[PDB]
Amino acid sequence: TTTIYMDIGDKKRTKGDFDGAIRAYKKVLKADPNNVETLLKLGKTYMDIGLPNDAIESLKKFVVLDTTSAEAYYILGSANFMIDEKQAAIDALQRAIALNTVYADAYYKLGLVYDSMGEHDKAIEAYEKTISIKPGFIRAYQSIGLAYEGKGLRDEAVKYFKKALEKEEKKAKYELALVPR
Template sequence: MGINVDTGDLKVFLRTVSIKGKMFMDSLVNGYNKMLQLNPADAKGIYMDVGTKLRDKGDYEGAIRSFKKVLDVDTVNAEALYEIGRTYLKVGLPNEAIESLGRATNLDRSSALSLFYLGSAYFMVDDNPKAQWALLEAIKLDPTYAEAYYKLGLVYDNMSDYDNAIESYKKAVSIKPNLIKAYQSIGLAYEAKGQREEAVKYFKMALQNEEKAV
């Protein structure tokens, strides 16, 4: 039977892992497990925290290994699958991300974040219909998700559907008025439609927002 773990001990342990990095992760966690007789819930929490710390340090390989340790304890852990998928995206491995994020969204259809990153991964492999589906599902769950509208605009752009692209970008800036890349993308979409005057207007708006941000 597991015992309750003192929060102070956990903080010291996690700080040690953060300093030592992936080479010591398994031995440290295994030793900590034996010492405190961790139950599965405690072990999952530690591996998730370690994975997050390693990813924050830029150790993506170590982070993925740590998140995968959660799956050794709980094979249907949607949070771990989501974090693995996000990390694969960071290192430019969209197919691996699709596999993990697809499993995560099948387990938990209530996560707009999982669907957003799944859509992003599909976009990276030029699977526009699936990217469109995932992003629209993310927006259904969170109608204020500006980045999802922006990414959806990129998908429409990729399909040469400039009217829907412009509509999506405009929705993004209506939610997040300082989203400079969306103004730029609106300008490019109008340029592609041959509407130079409208394109220039939005390029100017992008510049104005850049100046405000300085």
């Protein structure tokens, strides 16, 4: 029953029928409002269609019931940044990271949030952690550069902008298909 409607929702979501998927998950939640698996799926469905404000309604209920999912916190904090709730974003992303200390997406997002607030040194710390986990992630070097510009340290900024370029300098010369297809 929970099972039957959750399956309908999953299959509708896969098919791109996001209104149907939401209907099915809502039906699950009418009967079983504390179904955390459904709360996370309804949240994710709303994120898929670019409605973080609706997603957060489900993800808030999820974390009341379950404080153990790094992903839920990541999505909640990401959504909070989308809706201009930056301290709630930080709080959630911190929770995600505390739950998974190698969660590169969370550290990158946390850095984006801090830099948006003018918190350039906190941002650099989070981006540095991002690069320690995924040293091939080019935009993190760019983002570090921007944070240094934010501090008025243009020489350090240009050092990181150049680091970003250096990551693909071999490919740019020695391969043929560079530009997006």
